[PDB]
């Protein structure tokens, strides 16, 4: 999931993006 080291908000969803993973 992209919320392994980046930052977003919490009960973002695991959305694929172009590093491999990001937040929805």
Known sequence: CPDAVYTC??????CRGLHGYGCC
């Open 9 to 14: 908000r919490p009960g973002q969803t695991c």
